[PDB]
Write a protein that binds this ligand. Structure first.
Ligand SMILES: Nc1nc(=O)c2ncn([C@@H]3O[C@@H]4COP(=O)(O)O[C@H]5[C@@H](O)[C@H](n6cnc7c(N)ncnc76)O[C@@H]5COP(=O)(O)O[C@@H]3[C@@H]4O)c2[nH]1
Lengths: 170, 170
């Protein structure tokens, strides 16, 4: 399956490389009490906007974490950057975390729109479900995941309330 | 198929975003004489080193192109960087280009090594072939590709000679 490959791609070329160095990057930034995990937004509708504040105005960009750099596949100093968001609830800052959407969900979205990609617009939801299921299975038994990462899967609503529910569990 | 999804992912979340802005970045750097296309290395063995000079000492890093920046899926100022290499032939600089390996080939490589990933070590070569075939089909009919991109697919040997052969065609 394409979803299965994308979930494996997402772990191999991203999660596996950034999750081990994430603690040191948040500690560096702290030294506005940002949480220690990467919160990954997984909309099952594959609706992935580039600006989180457009999805919910109660999610507001605060700052970027110090950039991660690595030589990768002929690219000298490839950059991995993560953004810090503050979550508002009735005019109050209720949480602060490293938040982003899972980017492969934009591939599933674009593949369902292009005729030569071979999967209908109808198939988007089950591909998104298989992607979340594969990613949860990978992170269940992955070493780089040590209470380091949280997946927020959802079907449409308040996005900031959805994130806060997961944040309040810790 | 996994390869098919990875080729679509490679075009949607990368080629489609960097190919239209590539000319303007090479022109800026040229203000030597770097070629106008992105040369994409596609080893069918999925052998993707992080340093190009280790694959062939006749391929030597020169400089980075001005970074490309975009807000993407909740990541403010996500960075896309490309490296400029010089190709040597008997102690002479024979070519200068923006060169890199296709990164999904590291996913196919890692998936053939992990038991929960679904395809064996045996399947690596045909997945790499399907990936190249899908990517060639995508770039045949893609608008962003306007004598902008060159795929260098190969089975093992001199890598710099393989790149120079493609460079000398233009
Ligand atoms: N050569 C190269 N240079 C790049 O800068 C780059 N950026 C993406 N890609 C490849 O394009 C395709 C589409 O990208 P997508 O965002 O959907 O997936 C990405 C994305 O979900 C995540 N990821 C990797 N690097 C970053 C990053 N810097 N910021 C956010 N997410 C990232 O992990 C997936 C796999 O990454 P790569 O394994 O490097 O391969 C991707 C993929 O094949 C790149 N390929």
């Amino acid at each position: 399956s394409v979803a299965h490959g994308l979930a494996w791609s997402y772990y191999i070329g991203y999660l596996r490389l950034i999750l081990p160095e994430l603690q040191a990057r948040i500690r560096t930034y702290n030294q506005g009490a940002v949480s220690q995990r990467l919160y990954i937004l997984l909309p099952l509708d594959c609706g992935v906007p580039d600006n989180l504040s457009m999805a919910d105005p109660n999610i507001r960009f605060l700052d970027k974490l110090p950039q991660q750099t690595a030589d990768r596949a002929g690219i000298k100093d490839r950059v991995y950057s993560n953004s810090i968001y503050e979550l508002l609830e009735n005019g109050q800052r209720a949480g602060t975390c490293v938040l982003e959407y899972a980017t492969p969900l934009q591939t599933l979205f674009a593949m369902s729109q292009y005729s030569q990609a071979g999967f209908s617009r109808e198939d988007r939801l089950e591909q998104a479900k298989l992607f979340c299921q594969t990613l949860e299975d990978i992170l269940a038994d992955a070493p780089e995941s040590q209470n380091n990462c949280r997946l927020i899967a959802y079907q449409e609503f308040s996005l900031s309330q959805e994130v806060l529910r997961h944040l309040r569990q810790e």
